[PDB]
């Protein structure tokens, strides 16, 4: 579903992915949002690839990735999370829609995105489901 990205992200210092395994996940750094906002995307896959390429071009965001993960984001691929944070065949950091798409959330609004591990993304959706009761 094609669209235009919007949103600004957050000012982030330090290790921007450390919190991806916990809580609400981590916001998108504003300097990554700046490389995407206003651009048109053909599909979610297109956005995801350009998102990780934007990460690859930012020294601050690259600094807390392993060397192998720096290679992968330079190819527009998501970096791998540690094994304890995998969920079935899902092994890489995921972009989660904070208000889910299925709950009226925006697809390419960067302020509706966080990064989460596969394990934490699944937990967040379980928790959202429970809280409907
Ligand atoms: Ni999600």
Numbering used by the authors: 643 to 775
The article reads:
Immunity proteins protect the colicin producing, or “colicinogenic”, bacteria by binding and inactivating colicin nucleases with very high affinity (Kd ≈ 10− 14 M) and specificity; the discrimination in binding affinity between cognate and non-cognate nucleases by Im proteins can be up to 10 orders of magnitude. The immunity protein associated with DNase colicins has an unusual mode of action; rather than binding directly to the DNase catalytic core, these proteins associate with the nuclease domain at an exosite adjacent to the enzyme active site.
AP41 DNase domain adopts the typical mixed α/β HNH fold seen in other DNase bacteriocins. In the AP41 DNase structure, the Ni2 + ion displays octahedral coordination geometry, which is coordinated by His738, His763 and His767; by a single water molecule from solution; and by the hydroxyl and a carbonyl oxygen from a citrate anion within the crystallisation solution. We found that the AP41 DNase is most active in the presence of Ni2 + or Mg2 + ions whilst showing no detectable activity in the presence of Zn2 +. The two conserved water molecules that are seen in the pyocin AP41 DNase–Im complex are also observed in the apo AP41 DNase structure.
